[PDB]
Amino acid sequence: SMFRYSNWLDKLYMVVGTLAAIIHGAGLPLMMLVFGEMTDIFANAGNNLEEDMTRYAYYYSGIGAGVLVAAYIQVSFWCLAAGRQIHKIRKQFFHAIMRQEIGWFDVHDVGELNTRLTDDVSKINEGIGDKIGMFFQSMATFFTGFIVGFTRGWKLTLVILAISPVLGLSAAVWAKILSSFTDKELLAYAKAGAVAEEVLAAIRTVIAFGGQKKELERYNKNLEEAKRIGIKKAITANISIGAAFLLIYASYALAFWYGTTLVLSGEYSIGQVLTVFFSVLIGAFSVGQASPSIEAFANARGAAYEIFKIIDNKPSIDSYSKSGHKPDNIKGNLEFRNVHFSYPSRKEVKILKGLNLKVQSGQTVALVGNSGCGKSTTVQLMQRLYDPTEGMVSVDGQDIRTINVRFLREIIGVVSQEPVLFATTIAENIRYGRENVTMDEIEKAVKEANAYDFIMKLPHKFDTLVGERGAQLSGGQKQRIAIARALVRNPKILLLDEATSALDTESEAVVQVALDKARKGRTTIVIAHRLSTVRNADVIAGFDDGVIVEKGNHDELMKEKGIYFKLVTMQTSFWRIMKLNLTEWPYFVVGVFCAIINGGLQPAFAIIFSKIIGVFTRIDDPETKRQNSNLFSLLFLALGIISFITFFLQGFTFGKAGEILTKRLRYMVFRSMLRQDVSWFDDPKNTTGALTTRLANDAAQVKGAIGSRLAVITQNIANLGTGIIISFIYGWQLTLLLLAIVPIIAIAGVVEMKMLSGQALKDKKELEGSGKIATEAIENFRTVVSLTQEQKFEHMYAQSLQVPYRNSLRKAHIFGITFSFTQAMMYFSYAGCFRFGAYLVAHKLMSFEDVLLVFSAVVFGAMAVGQVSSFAPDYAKAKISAAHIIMIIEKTPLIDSYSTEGLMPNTLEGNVTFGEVVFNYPTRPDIPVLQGLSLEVKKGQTLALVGSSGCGKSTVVQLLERFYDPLAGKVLLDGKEIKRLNVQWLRAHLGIVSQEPILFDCSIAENIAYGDNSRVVSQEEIVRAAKEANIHAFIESLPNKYSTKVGDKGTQLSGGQKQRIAIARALVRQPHILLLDEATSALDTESEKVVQEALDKAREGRTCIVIAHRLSTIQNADLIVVFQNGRVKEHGTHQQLLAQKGIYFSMVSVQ
Ligand SMILES: COc1ccc(CCN(C)CCC[C@](C#N)(c2ccc(OC)c(OC)c2)C(C)C)cc1OC
Ligand SMILES: Nc1ncnc2c1ncn2[C@@H]1O[C@H](COP(=O)(O)OP(=O)(O)OP(=O)(O)O)[C@@H](O)[C@H]1O
Ligand SMILES: Nc1ncnc2c1ncn2[C@@H]1O[C@H](COP(=O)(O)OP(=O)(O)OP(=O)(O)O)[C@@H](O)[C@H]1O
Ligand SMILES: [Mg+2]
Ligand SMILES: [Mg+2]
């Protein structure tokens, strides 16, 4: 039940604030009783009073000042306590996440963890900021009203109490519905948001395969579900509002039943009865307004329990534990015996079944194994990402548990086969790798990393920008950057995986030699697949089924007739904003008629009540006037019923219009994004997170800017006009004070509601950066844990959140001050109006009834306008967001992907002709990669591409897929211009596989079927693809078969498995022309020959392009082309290339 246990001074401050709120709530019935007594005194006088009026005004002013001071103090204390608690909870959660083990992170989805940390924290802040204080004040006011009624009212008090519970329940329901709107909207739209985020994550592959139809259908279904949920919520809110409105009419009808009882009633005059009724109404309103705190108490308790459970997950392996010891004389020595471990996703499968391995300091040790032999698993185990199920792994003869992952990973840096990076500058990545580099270690790593051409020629050598996940950077460039970053860290246990054997082997000799420069000062384990690299390795160890079989020098392995020998032998405005008229044309007017009706509801009742007040005055008029009072009460009840009906109708119409507009806008935005140039997405402005936030936080802004804005404006204008007309007609002198106080009162009312939406929006805007940092740390938590950078990340997050904490505290203080000022202004205005009415009554300028009616009408109009403005959103920054949205819809891309204009060829001959083709990237158009190269390819021809890293082969392949356009030259397919052909049709027929393909985090079968878009992918196609790629056996070996779930970035499979899956999907796509980038890679080279050779069987009848460092794969190619700085030095048969002493000949000789 209790969740607060820190900052006992904070608890005392909260208690003081609650006491002040209760005092104000109790005083409110005191003000009601004072008003009733003043009314009774005026009625008695009408049947000297200046001194009494002045004394009452002074007492009211003092009471209002005290109430305002107490309310301000309570609000400020509650806001400060809520902010401090939120900050402390966020810090504790960050610390727990940093201390959280790798297993916990693997078990719980990182995206789900971030979503929880955001949503639960926001809900706790919303439900603990002002809800408790408001509930306490409402309860105190209700108790004071009940106490006052018990001693004053007798039968009237009993009737008021009996009628109270229905109105209290209605107000409670209305408050609960109004308070928790985000929980209903964002929760429903979370599915659509996640779908959009997933689509944006692999938009590149989606455009490559043209699978926009499925994404559009899913988005449409999610939008329809969200619209249905919103319509239901709006209907419920309208019903609650109608019930609340009818409650006032019912209460008025019940009160009017007195009649013959006269003002005397039991023992008091009409003033006492009116005061009792007002106190009962105030108590019922407070009870209704105290409900939301209790209603959200359950959600707050659930969020607090979840946060505590996450924080209270103290694991055995703690990064902040002081029980361990930090090793200093860490000599290079590793020993693993009977090492057995199983992944958590598939516990049944045991990749490692024990083995004996020993590595000495300053010794280059390489591991060679079959497909999925456990090389990546062994590297991960060495990095301490997981734990050993059985066996014993020690470093320097000491158990790993002695120094924990803390001292294990913090001293050894490793690079994965496909290292991840951040969309920032290269210098930023270097600094992230090591903060204390001082520009010396970075320079040394750059010199050793052999990365000069890319850094030098490209602009901003130390500030060169890289897209998401280093998309702009080349695969070889990315590998070189990762190697340099690892070297800069100055690690003692180097871990090399797929250094440069990705695209061309020519760079491999340049890279491996560099690795030989510094390979004796510390232990180094590398995963080599080339013959030269394997031979250069000091020691090579053979693994099979997770068991070490061979271990020794290259000569020993060759003479042992082991797996290495077999592998070697095998190798050999309104117009732009009011766009709802298409669907809202026959409904908006229906709402408008309601809005005007609402404008008439506020003043009309103000008059009717006034007509009652005068009827209740002058000794309740004569006996004949009783029928007039009854008629006035009946008219007021009818007007209230009509107003409730009109409000319900207007709310339903507004909700329907808003839902329709939001759905249409979302559909248009999705269509525009799908039919957009690929180059547009490759820019810092089109960030995945920023784009998702803009897309999600658009419906509410547009709705509030158009529909709610118009409704509020119309209602306020109508109310103000009606009030002014009534005051002028029935007011001569008192109208001046009402007009003077109108603007301040209206502003206070507009800023009189909860206004939590603005505070939440400001907090989200401030903490967007902190959330992005947290997401980056969680997604790449493995990299941070490897370098033991948890403390630095936590410090950075705290520093970034500190400013938002101060801004939120200042905003809360400002809001509390504004609320206190509004309350004090209302209290003083009441006394001023009473004094003005008394002064007017003293003279013959106007009667008491007219002045009272004018004052009541003015006050009611101002309060209604303020409440409508505060509750209903109005002009704000949302309009600006609309400018960012509409321009997106109206924007047209350079290439009309959606447009069907395109020549339809009779048949596909699989012929490509490029001549003098020159292309330049959009981000860096001053550094072109092509100088007018040419290439001819015929049907059923196998072409291989080689050359220096980043020579343009990948760029040429991308251009072939119509990803971009050439600055100059000519590109034709089967003697036909590519630009004059369908883009989607051409892409669907192109089997393009990138160096780092993206696999959706879903079932393997679903991912495979997604390759063949616009057609049904039966299980037979998947089986055939697996057989072609030899993946059926692997799928059967793994649990769930094709139903196995895929985690983030394919966490359930290795790089080789992902490459095989991508190849199988491309084959299933039935591509007339196929292209692969870094298809071979390490990927268990021995297994690759099994798959690659199979491709040769399927290569018949189609043109295939393969780029890889291995010479064996290129040998089978019909033609081989070498590109040097975008220029094809030579092209022809393998024998011709071998005869010529070119780049290819030199590479072959080196290998
Ligand atoms: C509708 O019938 C009426 C009932 C009471 C009163 C005035 C009674 N006086 C003691 C002043 C109290 C002001 C009052 C309270 N409590 C109040 C004012 C502003 C508020 O913030 C929006 C509020 O909410 C807590 C309550 C309510 C009557 C509106 C006027 C009325 O006519 C408008
Ligand atoms: N997190 C995981 N959950 C389940 N299975 C996994 C996970 N990581 C890897 N695997 C699978 O377990 C086996 C581990 O193979 P490992 O990656 O260690 O060897 P490898 O020869 O270096 O791999 P590759 O050439 O595919 O990169 C492979 O089948 C891999 O698909
Ligand atoms: N979107 C991009 N914006 C700017 N420069 C880019 C972009 N994509 C690639 N580059 C640059 O173009 C060159 C990439 O060359 P290319 O795409 O032809 O690859 P490659 O030589 O086949 O091999 P790899 O797979 O290693 O990139 C590198 O200079 C890279 O920095
Ligand atoms: Mg591997
Ligand atoms: Mg490439």
Most informative mutation of 474, 923, 929, 1125 for ligand 3 (most atoms within 8 A of CB): 474
How far apart CA 874 and CA 755 sit, in angstroms, is 12
Residues annotated within the binding site are 369-376, 947-954
How far apart CA 972 and CA 965 sit, in angstroms, is 12
Question: How far is ligand 1, taken at its centre, from the CA of residue 282, in Å?
Answer: 7
Cβ 341 vs Cβ 381: under 8 Å:
yes
386 CB near ligand 2 (under 6 Å): no
Residues 6+ apart with CB under 8 A from 272: 36, 40, 152, 153
How far apart CA 137 and CA 416 sit, in angstroms, is 59
Task: Give the count of beta carbons closer than 10 Å to the beta carbon of residue 482.
Answer: 23
Cβ 151 vs Cβ 218: under 8 Å:
no
* Residue 681 burial (C-beta neighbours within 10 Å; 0-12, 13-18, 19+): buried
Cβ 1130 vs Cβ 1137: under 8 Å:
yes
Task: Give the count of beta carbons closer than 10 Å to the beta carbon of residue 562.
Answer: 19
Q: Which residues pair with 333 in a beta bridge?
A: 360
Picking from 513, 537, 535, the residue whose alpha carbon sits closest to that of residue 366 is 537
Structure tokens at 793: 């990340």
Cβ 483 vs Cβ 449: under 8 Å:
yes
Under the phi-then-psi rule, with left for phi > 0, alpha for psi from -120 to 50, and beta for the rest, what region is 932?
left
Question: How far is ligand 1, taken at its centre, from the CA of residue 260, in Å?
Answer: 28
Cα 918 to Cα 182, 591, 928: the distances in Å are 52, 60, 8
Dihedral sign computed on CA atoms, order 341, 343, 344, 350: negative
Q: What is the DSSP letter of 100?
A: S
Q: Which residues pair with 337 in a beta bridge?
A: 356, 392
1057 CB near ligand 2 (under 6 Å): yes
How far apart CA 287 and CA 169 sit, in angstroms, is 8
HSE value, Cβ hemisphere, 13 Å, CA-based, for 220: 8
Which residues have beta carbons under 5 A from ligand 5 (an ion)? 503, 954, 1077
Q: What is the DSSP letter of 977?
A: B
Q: Which residues pair with 398 in a beta bridge?
A: 395
How far apart CA 100 and CA 104 sit, in angstroms, is 7
How far apart CA 5 and CA 14 sit, in angstroms, is 13
How far apart CA 643 and CA 640 sit, in angstroms, is 5
How far apart CA 212 and CA 200 sit, in angstroms, is 11
Q: What is the DSSP letter of 949?
A: T
Per DSSP, the chain holds a count of helices (H) and strands (E) of 43, 19
Picking from 854, 882, 892, the residue whose alpha carbon sits closest to that of residue 725 is 854
Task: Give the count of beta carbons closer than 10 Å to the beta carbon of residue 919.
Answer: 22
In the chain, residues preceding a discontinuity (C to N beyond 2.5 A) are 47, 572
Domains along the sequence of the chain with CATH:
8-314+577-889 (1.20.1560.10), 333-414+491-571 (3.40.50.300), 912-1150 (3.40.50.300)
- Name the one residue in this structure whose structure tokens are 């079989």: 549
Structure tokens at 232: 């239901």
Task: Give the count of beta carbons closer than 10 Å to the beta carbon of residue 515.
Answer: 22
DSSP 344-392: STTSS--SEE--EEEEETT-EEEEEESTT-SHHHHHHHHHTSS--SEEE
Task: Give the count of beta carbons closer than 10 Å to the beta carbon of residue 266.
Answer: 13
Ligand nearest to the CA of 374: 2
Ligand nearest to the CA of 1084: 2
How far apart CA 823 and CA 521 sit, in angstroms, is 75
Residues annotated within the binding site for ATP are 369-376, 947-954
1052 CB near ligand 2 (under 6 Å): yes
749 CA: nearest ligand 1 atom:
22
How far apart CA 111 and CA 193 sit, in angstroms, is 12
Interior/surface letters 446-471, b for 16+ CB within 10 angstroms, e for the rest: bebbbbeebbeebeeeeebbbbbbbe
Ligand 1 neighbours by CB, cut-off 6 Å: 28, 31-32, 35, 278, 282, 752, 826, 830, 856, 859-860
Cβ 660 vs Cβ 699: under 8 Å:
no
682 CB near ligand 3 (under 6 Å): yes
How far apart CA 127 and CA 607 sit, in angstroms, is 39
Q: Which residues pair with 1104 in a beta bridge?
A: 942, 1074
Residues 6+ apart with CB under 8 A from 792: 435
* Residue 569 burial (C-beta neighbours within 10 Å; 0-12, 13-18, 19+): exposed
DSSP 900-943: ---B--S-----EEEEEEE---SS-TTS-S-SSEEEEE-TT-EE
475 CA: nearest ligand 3 atom:
26
Most informative mutation of 347, 348, 376 for ligand 2 (most atoms within 8 A of CB): 376
Structure tokens at 696: 């999600």
Interior/surface letters 734-772, b for 16+ CB within 10 angstroms, e for the rest: bbebbeebbebbbbbbbbbbbbbbebebebeebbeebbe
Query: Is 621 strand, coil or helix?
Result: coil
Interior/surface letters 311-329, b for 16+ CB within 10 angstroms, e for the rest: beeeeebbbeeeebeebee
Picking from 755, 746, 756, 723, the residue whose alpha carbon sits closest to that of residue 825 is 746
Cβ 547 vs Cβ 563: under 8 Å:
no
CA angle 941, 947, 948 (to 5 degrees): 155
DSSP 128-156: HHSHHHHHHHHHHHHHHHHHHHHHS-THH
Cβ 818 vs Cβ 23: under 8 Å:
no
CA angle 50, 56, 59 (to 5 degrees): 140
DSSP 496-565: EESSSTTS-SHHHHHHHHHHHHT-SSSEEEEE--SHHHHHHSSEEEEEETTEEEEEE-HHHHHHTT-HHH
* Residue 151 burial (C-beta neighbours within 10 Å; 0-12, 13-18, 19+): exposed
